[PDB]
Amino acid sequence: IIIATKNGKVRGMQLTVFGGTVTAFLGIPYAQPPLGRLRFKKPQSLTKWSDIWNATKYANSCCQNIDQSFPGFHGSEMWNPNTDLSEDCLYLNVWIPAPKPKNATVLIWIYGGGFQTGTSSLHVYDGKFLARVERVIVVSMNYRVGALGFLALPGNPEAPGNMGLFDQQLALQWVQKNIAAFGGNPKSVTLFGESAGAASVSLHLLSPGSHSLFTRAILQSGSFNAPWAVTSLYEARNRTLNLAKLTGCSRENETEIIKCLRNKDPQEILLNEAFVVPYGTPLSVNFGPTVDGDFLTDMPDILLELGQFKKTQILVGVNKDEGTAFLVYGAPGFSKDNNSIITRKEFQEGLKIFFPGVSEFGKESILFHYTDWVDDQRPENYREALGDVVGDYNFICPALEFTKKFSEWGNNAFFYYFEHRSSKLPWPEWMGVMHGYEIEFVFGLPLERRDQYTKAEEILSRSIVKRWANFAKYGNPQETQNQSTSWPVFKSTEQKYLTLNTESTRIMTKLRAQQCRFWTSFFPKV
Ligand SMILES: *[C@@H]1O[C@H](CO[C@@H]2O[C@@H](C)[C@@H](O)[C@@H](O)[C@@H]2O)[C@@H](O[C@@H]2O[C@H](CO)[C@@H](O[C@@H]3O[C@H](CO)[C@@H](O)[C@H](O)[C@@H]3O)[C@H](O)[C@H]2NC(C)=O)[C@H](O)[C@H]1NC(C)=O
Ligand SMILES: *[C@@H]1O[C@H](CO[C@@H]2O[C@@H](C)[C@@H](O)[C@@H](O)[C@@H]2O)[C@@H](O[C@@H]2O[C@H](CO)[C@@H](O)[C@H](O)[C@H]2NC(C)=O)[C@H](O)[C@H]1NC(C)=O
Ligand SMILES: *[C@@H]1O[C@H](CO[C@@H]2O[C@@H](C)[C@@H](O)[C@@H](O)[C@@H]2O)[C@@H](O[C@@H]2O[C@H](CO)[C@@H](O)[C@H](O)[C@H]2NC(C)=O)[C@H](O)[C@H]1NC(C)=O
Ligand SMILES: *C(=O)N(C)c1cccc2c(CN(C)CCC3CCCCCC3)c[nH]c12
Ligand SMILES: *[C@@H]1O[C@H](CO[C@@H]2O[C@@H](C)[C@@H](O)[C@@H](O)[C@@H]2O)[C@@H](O)[C@H](O)[C@H]1NC(C)=O
Ligand SMILES: *[C@@H]1O[C@H](CO[C@@H]2O[C@@H](C)[C@@H](O)[C@@H](O)[C@@H]2O)[C@@H](O)[C@H](O)[C@H]1NC(C)=O
Numbered sequence: 322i323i324i325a326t327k328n329g330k331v332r333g334m335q336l337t338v339f340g341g342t343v344t345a346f347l348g349i350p351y352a353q354p355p356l357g358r359l360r361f362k363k364p365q366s367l368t369k370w371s372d373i374w375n376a377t378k379y380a381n382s383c384c385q386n387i388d389q390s391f392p393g394f395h396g397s398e399m400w401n402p403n404t405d406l407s408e409d410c411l412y413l414n415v416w417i418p419a420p421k422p423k424n425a426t427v428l429i430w431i432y433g434g435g436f437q438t439g440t441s442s443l444h445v446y447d448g449k450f451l452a453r454v455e456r457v458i459v460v461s462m463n464y465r466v467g468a469l470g471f472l473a474l475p476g477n478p479e480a481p482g483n484m485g486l487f488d489q490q491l492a493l494q495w496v497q498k499n500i501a502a503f504g505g506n507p508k509s510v511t512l513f514g515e516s517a518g519a520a521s522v523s524l525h526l527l528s529p530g531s532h533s534l535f536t537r538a539i540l541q542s543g544s545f546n547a548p549w550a551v552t553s554l555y556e557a558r559n560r561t562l563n564l565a566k567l568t569g570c571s572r573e574n575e576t577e578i579i580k581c582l583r584n585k586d587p588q589e590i591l592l593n594e595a596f597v598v599p600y601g602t603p604l605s606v607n608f609g610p611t612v613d614g615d616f617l618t619d620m621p622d623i624l625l626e627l628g629q630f631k632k633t634q635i636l637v638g639v640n641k642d643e644g645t646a647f648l649v650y651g652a653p654g655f656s657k658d659n660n661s662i663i664t665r666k667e668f669q670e671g672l673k674i675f676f677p678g679v680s681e682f683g684k685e686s687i688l689f690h691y692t693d694w695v696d697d698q699r700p701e702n703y704r705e706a707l708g709d710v711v712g713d714y715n716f717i718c719p720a721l722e723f724t725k726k727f728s729e730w731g732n733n734a735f736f737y738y739f740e741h742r743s744s745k746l747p748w749p750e751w752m753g754v755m756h757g758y759e760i761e762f763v764f765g766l767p768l769e770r771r772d773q774y775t776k777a778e779e780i781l782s783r784s785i786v787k788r789w790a791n792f793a794k795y796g797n798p799q800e801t802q803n804q805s806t807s808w809p810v811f812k813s814t815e816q817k818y819l820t821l822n823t824e825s826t827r828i829m830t831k832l833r834a835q836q837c838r839f840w841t842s843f844f845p846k847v
């Protein structure tokens with residue numbers, strides 16, 4: 322099957338899914354490849370082609386450094402790129418139902434990876450199940466990451482910052498101009514993403530140039546006000562300069578520095594990216610979103626607080642054990658291959674790793690609020706507190722604060738707490754319900770009976786998929802038929818949220834109230 326787009330015809334491929342068919346268009350280009358003089362610049366519009374573009378395989382993933390912390394371990398390597406790395410990577414994917422829909426709602430996935438890694442071609446982002454089961458169209462795109470996507474000398478168009486965010490935006494634009502030709506509804510577009518993808522979605526809610534390019538938004542385990550998600554303009558400059566020094570590209574004319582960095586080979590840039598920070602952490606974001614005066618007109622805490630964002634519905638949520646995955650990437654006494662019982666001294670050293678530039682008093686205050694136990698003899702006490710510290714600070718409390726602030730301006734918001742640990746999880750049990758492991762439920766992988774998930778997991782994915790699709794189509798994440806628990810709107814008064822698990826979906830109130838009053842009220846003062 323062949324589709325005529327505004328820039329030329331593209332050929333897809335038929336996929337067998339669940340005794341039906343999905344048409345997949347894998348690797349459609351949506352911008353001029355950002356090479357040569359175009360490196361670090363905003364994405365340029367694509368010149369029309371006259372042939373038939375063969376969109377039958379995922380395209381190159383963008384240049385990025387690979388996680389090598391556990392070679393051979395599927396738990397970490399499933400997140401690594403699975404196509405060739407290349408600067409020529411501005412491509413997107415489309416899954417459409419077969420038979421071709423008339424006016425399907427469109428879901429646009431933006432992957433995470435700390436703005437330094439990720440790719441749309443990961444197995445857990447395969448949108449063919451969503452298209453088969455709910456008859457939505459799933460779009461996903463690759464966007465530039467790391468220095469190549471977020472290097473910033475702000476106000477200077479040779480490297481203005483936020484390029485990877487403009488990559489995303491130009492793909493959103495592509496959907497507006499072309500998706501009706503695939504049977505999609507440009508007026509019914511929901512962005513969803515996880516971690517830096519969710520942070521990206523929250524910044525699209527804030528960017529005026531994205532407001533006309535989507536309807537609704539879903540934020541999984543991330544939002545821009547998370548402490549790792551926005552690079553200050555001070556650091557962005559100190560980091561651009563450091564990378565210049567590492568690469569032998571220090572000049573005086575700022576533009577001349579970028580010209581120098583433009584002649585460097587991609588691997589030279591990538592290898593020096595790591596050491597541009599003085600004190601890195603497992604959650605470090607070397608080159609990330611900045612206030613550029615283009616995509617972001619002001620500091621986003623200010624825009625959020627004062628109601629300067631797209632008025633629409635949002636679905637936001639977090640996982641029960643967001644923080645535990647990151648403890649094996651640096652915290653002493655931790656290991657995925659043992660139960661990681663750490664001492665009080667190890668917990669204190671762990672705070673130094675995760676809060677490097679924080680004062681002594683600030684680290685003590687973290688310790689004070691997370692080490693008054695129900696049982697002081699519980700030998701896992703400090704292991705779980707450090708996971709809770711990292712998860713509350715970096716994910717849960719920023720998600721809740723975003724949802725509170727956003728809803729205060731009249732919009733319906735829906736908050737979830739995901740507490741099911743995948744039965745096939747290759748990580749150890751002490752890490753519980755890890756960051757990133759709701760994604761496969763959202764994308765409906767457990768609906769495939771051949772893939773040795775439990776039956777209760779098939780049902781949970783089925784209900785989750787229906788709720789996501791109803792949110793995108795109707796602004797309302799209900800499952801209205803199988804006598805499901807009604808998902809109430811999150812209000813700033815009562816702060817109700819829905820728990821997602823295989824046993825009982827409960828409605829609860831005021832998630833992590835005590836912990837988040839420490840993080841969002843006390844801790845920013847330190
Ligand atoms: C596909 O469906 C859309 C409607 O999509 C729905 O409405 C959105 C606002 C979102 O809430 C979506 O989640 C939701 O599913 C149809 O859009 C319709 O487009 C036509 C023109 O393209 C609009 O016609 C209007 O006609 C009046 C009077 O003649 C004019 O004055 C207006 O200027 C305007 O052109 C129509 O309002 C609009 N419908 C809605 C509800 O906004 C779209 O036509 C449809 N396409 C197909 C092929 O089915
Ligand atoms: C801002 O930048 C300076 C310079 O960074 C150093 O040089 C870069 C090329 C890169 O290799 C970094 O890792 C280097 O640290 C930072 O100054 C350094 O500060 C650390 C302690 O914070 C100190 O041990 C180094 O000796 C310093 N090096 C130099 C050359 O001054 C500085 O810390 C950065 N950040 C801030 C907030 O000032
Ligand atoms: C859990 O493991 C950590 C990490 O040690 C590594 O992994 C082990 C499974 C084993 O294969 C070791 O040989 C590895 O080095 C242990 O932390 C280390 O403990 C030693 C003291 O024995 C210390 O000198 C190291 O610095 C520690 N390494 C780190 C990264 O902290 C930890 O003691 C183990 N805990 C339990 C309860 O098994
Ligand atoms: C979201 O994108 N987040 C939370 C984020 C921030 C900074 C770096 C990130 C990386 C890459 N490395 C540092 C960690 C890889 C882990 C992530 C946990 C899931 C399973 C283990 C692999 C990824 N995400 C970020
Ligand atoms: C584009 O695709 C055309 C159609 O052929 C199909 O694609 C190739 C790759 C084979 O898998 C074939 O069995 C398929 O039916 C090709 O004839 C054409 O060469 C392709 N052109 C380019 C530039 O790739
Ligand atoms: C809803 O449930 C379907 C099967 O459940 C059966 O049908 C419902 C109406 C009840 O009678 C129940 O007791 C039966 O076991 C699933 O096939 C379907 O996928 C489910 N849909 C969603 C959105 O969860």
Ligand SMILES: CC(=O)N[C@H]1[C@H]([C@H](O)[C@H](O)CO)O[C@@](O)(C(=O)O)C[C@@H]1O
Binds near residue numbers: 381405407
């Ligand atoms: C960087 C990269 O992936 N380049 C190209 C690859 C490789 O050059 C070869 O497969 C050898 O590895 O091959 C293609 O031409 C192909 O045949 O589909 C597509 C792709 O653009």
Ligand SMILES: *[C@@H]1O[C@H](CO)[C@@H](O)[C@H](O)[C@H]1NC(C)=O
Binds near residue numbers: 574575576577
């Ligand atoms: C730097 O070089 C550019 C041309 O490459 C020039 O336009 C500019 O004036 C020079 N000086 C500064 C301060 O940018």
